[PDB]
């Protein structure tokens, strides 16, 4: 129960991974992959826009 | 010169100074005496057969108590009045409308001896 959570230690309420006690392993992995992939895509799109402006 | 920078578009009531009361005369001019002293919270014992049983076997003094007295006040009053350490206080408002307190003393004290010191065997 919510107040019962106050008497237990921190280990019982979380997992050692990032976003441990908040998000599941698969969702954390999906958002890591998403972050890395679309920041790389942001770099690619920025480079392509700069080079097309140079061409223009 | 320039106007004050207002990064919030809201206006709040400024924190003006709040002085402390400095009366020119006392409100009531005489502090009332203690409205609940030991002699008021501890009115009298209860000397029914059941209460005497609690005294003789349970090491428990049974008192009629001021209806406005709580367990802290009863404990303090019993300690101040009979020079005894108490272990627990239980209270109940009786069907006749008065407060009744079962005060259990520590094992270092004898309720029977304290009762026959008070005057009721």
């Amino acid at each position: 129960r919510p107040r019962q959570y106050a008497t237990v230690s921190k280990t019982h309420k979380t997992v050692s991974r990032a976003y441990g006690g908040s998000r599941c392993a698969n969702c954390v992995k999906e958002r890591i992959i998403r972050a890395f992939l679309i920041e790389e895509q942001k770099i690619v799109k920025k480079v392509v826009k700069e080079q097309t402006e140079a061409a223009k | 010169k320039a106007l004050k920078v207002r990064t919030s578009a809201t206006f709040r009531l400024p924190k003006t100074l709040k002085l402390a009361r400095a009366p020119k005369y006392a409100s009531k001019a005489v502090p009332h005496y203690n409205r609940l002293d030991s002699y008021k919270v501890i009115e009298q014992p209860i000397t029914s057969e059941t209460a005497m049983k609690k005294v003789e076997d349970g090491n428990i003094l049974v008192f009629q108590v001021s209806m406005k007295a709580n367990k802290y006040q009863i404990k303090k009053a019993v300690k101040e009045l009979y020079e005894v350490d108490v272990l627990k206080v239980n209270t109940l408002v009786r069907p006749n409308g008065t407060k009744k307190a079962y005060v259990r003393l520590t094992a270092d004290y004898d309720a029977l001896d304290i009762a026959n010191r008070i005057g009721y065997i």
Binding site: - | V5, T7, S8, A9, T10, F11
Partner: protein, 233 residues
């Protein structure tokens, strides 16, 4: 140098959280502030009849400063010197039996609205200054007409608070000189010449001239744009 990096935040429409801009233009002001500002705005927008805005024609800074310098020379007596004067005259009447003329004749500025109005009526007023800050304008709205009829030099000056500071108060709303000392009668005359040229002899023009009627800057821009695209043929 190799440890620091160029962040720059992009403040586009959907890019980054906006930084703390000065939003004083958009403050949700209290109602009293809002009523102050809108009272000003409405007085400006409404066509004011000549009797208003024959005020708001105050003197310029330098002539107002020299007028108030002369009047500070003619400042009234404060509580301390007044009480000292009372003690001195009491001692005088006690010892020399002088008929209450031991103390000299005061030379002071005359203040008080109805006192000064009576002074203009009896033509004792050598010069009169009228504030433009009077909360009900009708208290003094007639005063330039009275000064014109009586032929007494009048001016409209900025600050009932300034006049009050002159006559040793918070707010005088009018001041008047009736007597001048010989040492600065010339200064008063040279002041009155310009005061008169600015106010007394322009009385008919200022009584004919209608004031007010200005719009706000957005409305001015609107009529500017409309006029430009109209006369563009």
């Amino acid at each position: 140098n190799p440890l620091t990096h160029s962040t720059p935040k992009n403040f586009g429409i959907g890019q980054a959280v906006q930084p703390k801009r000065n939003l004083s233009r958009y403050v949700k002001w209290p109602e009293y502030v809002r009523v102050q500002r809108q009272k000003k705005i409405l007085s400006i927008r409404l066509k004011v009849p000549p009797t208003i805005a024959q005020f708001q024609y105050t003197l310029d800074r330098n002539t107002a400063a020299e007028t108030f310098k002369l009047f500070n020379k003619y400042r009234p007596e404060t509580a301390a010197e007044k009480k000292e004067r009372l003690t001195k005259e009491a001692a005088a009447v006690a010892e020399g039996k002088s008929k209450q003329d031991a103390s000299p004749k005061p030379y002071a500025v005359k203040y008080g609205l109805n006192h000064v109005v009576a002074l203009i009526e009896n033509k004792k007023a050598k010069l009169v200054l009228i504030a433009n800050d009077v909360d009900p304008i009708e208290l003094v709205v007639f005063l330039p007409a009275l000064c014109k009829k009586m032929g007494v030099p009048y001016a409209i000056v900025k600050g009932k608070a300034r006049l009050g500071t002159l006559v040793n108060q918070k707010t005088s709303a009018v001041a008047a000189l009736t007597e001048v000392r010989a040492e600065d009668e010339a200064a008063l005359a040279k002041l009155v010449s310009t005061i008169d040229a600015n106010f007394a002899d322009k009385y008919d023009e200022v009584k004919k001239h209608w004031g007010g009627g200005i719009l706000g800057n957005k409305a001015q821009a609107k009529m500017d744009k409309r006029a430009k695209n109209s006369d563009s043929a």
